[PDB]
Write an enzyme that holds these catalytic residues in place. Structure first.
Site, PDB file in Angstrom:
ATOM      1  N   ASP A 259     -33.726  44.843 111.247  1.00  0.00           N
ATOM      2  CA  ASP A 259     -34.059  43.802 112.565  1.00  0.00           C
ATOM      3  C   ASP A 259     -32.760  43.622 112.651  1.00  0.00           C
ATOM      4  O   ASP A 259     -32.227  42.223 112.973  1.00  0.00           O
ATOM      5  CB  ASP A 259     -34.840  43.053 111.237  1.00  0.00           C
TER       6      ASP A 259
ATOM      7  N   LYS B  25     -30.238  42.397 115.816  1.00  0.00           N
ATOM      8  CA  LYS B  25     -30.154  41.973 117.278  1.00  0.00           C
ATOM      9  C   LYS B  25     -29.408  40.727 117.024  1.00  0.00           C
ATOM     10  O   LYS B  25     -29.195  40.134 116.248  1.00  0.00           O
ATOM     11  CB  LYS B  25     -31.884  41.352 116.922  1.00  0.00           C
TER      12      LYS B  25
ATOM     13  N   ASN C  81     -30.454  37.779 115.038  1.00  0.00           N
ATOM     14  CA  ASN C  81     -29.994  37.334 113.359  1.00  0.00           C
ATOM     15  C   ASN C  81     -28.369  37.830 113.143  1.00  0.00           C
ATOM     16  O   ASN C  81     -28.424  37.692 111.783  1.00  0.00           O
ATOM     17  CB  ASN C  81     -31.109  38.638 112.605  1.00  0.00           C
TER      18      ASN C  81
ATOM     19  N   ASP D  49     -31.866  37.237 107.233  1.00  0.00           N
ATOM     20  CA  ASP D  49     -33.073  37.778 108.033  1.00  0.00           C
ATOM     21  C   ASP D  49     -33.631  39.333 107.336  1.00  0.00           C
ATOM     22  O   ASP D  49     -33.042  40.433 108.377  1.00  0.00           O
ATOM     23  CB  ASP D  49     -33.265  37.969 109.325  1.00  0.00           C
TER      24      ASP D  49
ATOM     25  N   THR E 174     -37.806  44.437 116.016  1.00  0.00           N
ATOM     26  CA  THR E 174     -37.896  43.530 117.463  1.00  0.00           C
ATOM     27  C   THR E 174     -38.195  44.739 118.554  1.00  0.00           C
ATOM     28  O   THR E 174     -37.078  45.920 118.758  1.00  0.00           O
ATOM     29  CB  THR E 174     -36.602  42.680 117.438  1.00  0.00           C
TER      30      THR E 174
HETATM   31  N1  LIG Z   1     -27.984  31.058 106.525  1.00  0.00           N
HETATM   32  C1  LIG Z   1     -28.289  30.344 107.807  1.00  0.00           C
HETATM   33  N2  LIG Z   1     -27.177  29.832 108.050  1.00  0.00           N
HETATM   34  C2  LIG Z   1     -27.430  29.217 109.516  1.00  0.00           C
HETATM   35  N3  LIG Z   1     -29.119  29.319 110.286  1.00  0.00           N
HETATM   36  C3  LIG Z   1     -29.529  30.758 109.321  1.00  0.00           C
HETATM   37  C4  LIG Z   1     -29.309  30.874 108.313  1.00  0.00           C
HETATM   38  N4  LIG Z   1     -30.520  32.258 108.421  1.00  0.00           N
HETATM   39  C5  LIG Z   1     -31.455  31.781 109.520  1.00  0.00           C
HETATM   40  N5  LIG Z   1     -30.910  31.079 109.918  1.00  0.00           N
HETATM   41  C6  LIG Z   1     -30.822  30.361 111.124  1.00  0.00           C
HETATM   42  O1  LIG Z   1     -32.817  30.447 111.449  1.00  0.00           O
HETATM   43  C7  LIG Z   1     -33.901  31.468 112.271  1.00  0.00           C
HETATM   44  C8  LIG Z   1     -35.228  32.098 111.262  1.00  0.00           C
HETATM   45  O2  LIG Z   1     -34.679  32.459 110.126  1.00  0.00           O
HETATM   46  P1  LIG Z   1     -34.677  34.238 110.323  1.00  0.00           P
HETATM   47  O3  LIG Z   1     -34.467  35.328 111.115  1.00  0.00           O
HETATM   48  O4  LIG Z   1     -34.074  34.976 108.285  1.00  0.00           O
HETATM   49  O5  LIG Z   1     -36.689  33.981 110.222  1.00  0.00           O
HETATM   50  P2  LIG Z   1     -37.736  35.039 110.420  1.00  0.00           P
HETATM   51  O6  LIG Z   1     -38.614  33.717 110.499  1.00  0.00           O
HETATM   52  O7  LIG Z   1     -37.637  36.116 109.980  1.00  0.00           O
HETATM   53  O8  LIG Z   1     -37.450  35.510 111.940  1.00  0.00           O
HETATM   54  P3  LIG Z   1     -37.969  37.158 112.898  1.00  0.00           P
HETATM   55  O9  LIG Z   1     -38.629  38.044 111.756  1.00  0.00           O
HETATM   56  O10 LIG Z   1     -38.538  36.356 113.732  1.00  0.00           O
HETATM   57  O11 LIG Z   1     -36.463  37.020 113.750  1.00  0.00           O
HETATM   58  C9  LIG Z   1     -32.404  32.478 112.107  1.00  0.00           C
HETATM   59  O12 LIG Z   1     -32.378  32.599 113.453  1.00  0.00           O
HETATM   60  C10 LIG Z   1     -31.036  31.602 112.328  1.00  0.00           C
HETATM   61  O13 LIG Z   1     -30.644  30.871 113.778  1.00  0.00           O
HETATM   62 MG   LIG Z   2     -37.514  38.120 109.977  1.00  0.00          MG
HETATM   63 MG   LIG Z   3     -34.685  36.406 112.287  1.00  0.00          MG
END
Ligand SMILES: Nc1ncnc2c1ncn2[C@@H]1O[C@H](COP(=O)(O)OP(=O)(O)OP(=O)(O)O)[C@@H](O)[C@H]1O
Ligand SMILES: [Mg+2]
Ligand SMILES: [Mg+2]
Lengths: 20, 339
Positions: free
Chosen positions: B155, B157, B160, B173, B190
């Site tokens: 993933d 992008k 992430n 992510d 994505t």
């Molecule tokens: N360690 C971190 N520190 C700061 N912000 C974070 C961190 N991890 C995640 N985030 C923020 O939270 C958002 C969502 O986290 P993540 O991408 O893990 O969730 P997701 O539900 O898997 O999203 P997707 O699968 O749709 O990309 C990230 O895009 C980022 O903006």
């Molecule tokens: Mg994700």
């Molecule tokens: Mg994500």
């Protein structure tokens, strides 16, 4: 321009992942 | 190149130890004060939190167990945590704690306060090639590391990728990360970043990460993706065509690298040939790249986010907040035993 077409499009914000 | 194969060999042994015996249950919810949502997702959200005992800030990813089971995402979720707790690399976000309660799964990461690469890229418009190259080099090393462990990331992008206080990348992510020695078949990722073989339901391997790197480099340098439209199916039509047009400002070296990464034919895609990652590391576009210096984080970053303190969230968008509910009955205990 390609940039102008992109910026006027529907997917310029955060893009969610997909699975099924 | 002898230092690196010995590094990877030792890296594989500590990964395998943690992969075989994962850490579990290393904190609990009431040790954290929840401050603000940093992002939401299909199964919950990521919140800025403050750990009471240390005062440190962290990013807490919260997943609703019942919803994960409902949407048939148990394996991906167990993958995400099992892999993230086992890896170790300068450009991977660190998992500091994990635990579960009656309702939710929790992954508590180092808080990367600089925000998403995505925000900075959209704000600035596009990155100059040396700026883009500085980030790309970090992803090249990171995929070299992950793939050596038989991991596929799936993933890549700008959403992430987080920018840390040093201006370096932290990959977050791991939701689609998978340890696999064969091909695999899940349609996931994505849309703009999917390799043709994913779309075509062919079965695919780690080469899809290198295709995604081609998309990332293009988007960083152009300010827009190589394949875009208003709906995914239209995006998929463009990807499988493989016709790519480049901005007039792209250097000759950049265009050549991208023709080789955005290669529809698996046989020919850089990263997937007999020389593997070295075809990329030795490409003319990376001639100025000191790979060891990047790994050691000794290269000066082209951009440093400003932070007004630990706990600052100014580099993140605002999200609607929600109460975190924990049932008095255990949900889905058997499904998530190993978490
Ligand atoms: N360690 C971190 N520190 C700061 N912000 C974070 C961190 N991890 C995640 N985030 C923020 O939270 C958002 C969502 O986290 P993540 O991408 O893990 O969730 P997701 O539900 O898997 O999203 P997707 O699968 O749709 O990309 C990230 O895009 C980022 O903006
Ligand atoms: Mg994700
Ligand atoms: Mg994500």
């Amino acid at each position: 321009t390609t940039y102008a077409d992109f910026i006027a499009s529907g997917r310029t914000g955060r893009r969610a992942s997909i699975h099924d | 190149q002898e230092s690196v194969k010995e590094f990877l060999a030792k890296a594989k042994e500590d990964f395998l130890k943690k992969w075989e015996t994962p850490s579990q249950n290393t904190a609990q919810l009431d040790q954290f004060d929840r401050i603000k949502t940093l992002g939401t997702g299909s199964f919950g959200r990521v919140m800025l939190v403050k750990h009471k005992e240390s005062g440190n800030h962290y990013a807490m990813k919260i997943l609703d167990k019942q919803k994960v089971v409902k949407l048939k995402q148990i394996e991906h979720t167990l993958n995400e945590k099992r892999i993230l707790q086992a890896v170790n690399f300068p450009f991977l976000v660190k998992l500091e704690f994990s635990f579960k309660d009656n309702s939710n799964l929790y992954m508590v990461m180092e808080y990367v306060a600089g925000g998403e690469m995505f925000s900075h890229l959209r704000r600035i418009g596009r990155f100059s090639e040396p700026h883009a190259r500085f980030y790309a080099a970090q992803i090249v090393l990171t995929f070299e590391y992950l793939h050596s462990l038989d991991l596929i990331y799936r993933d890549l992008k700008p959403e992430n990728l987080l920018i840390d206080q040093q201006g370096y990348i932290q990959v977050t992510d791991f939701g689609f990360a998978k340890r696999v020695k064969g091909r695999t078949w899940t349609l996931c990722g994505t849309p703009e970043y999917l390799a043709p073989e994913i779309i075509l339901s062919k079965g695919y391997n780690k080469a899809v990460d290198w295709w995604a790197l081609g998309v990332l480099i293009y988007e960083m340098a152009a300010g827009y993706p190589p394949f875009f439209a208003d709906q995914p199916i239209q995006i998929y039509e463009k990807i499988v065509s493989g016709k790519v047009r480049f901005p007039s400002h792209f250097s000759s070296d950049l265009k050549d690298l991208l023709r080789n990464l955005l290669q529809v034919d698996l046989t020919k895609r850089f990263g997937n040939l007999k020389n593997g990652v070295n075809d990329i590391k030795n490409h003319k576009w990376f001639a100025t790249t000191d790979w060891i210096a990047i790994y050691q984080r000794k290269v000066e970053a082209p951009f440093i986010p400003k932070f007004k303190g630990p706990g600052d969230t100014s580099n993140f968008d605002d999200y609607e907040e929600e109460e975190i509910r924990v049932s008095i009955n255990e949900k889905c205990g058997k499904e998530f035993t190993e978490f």
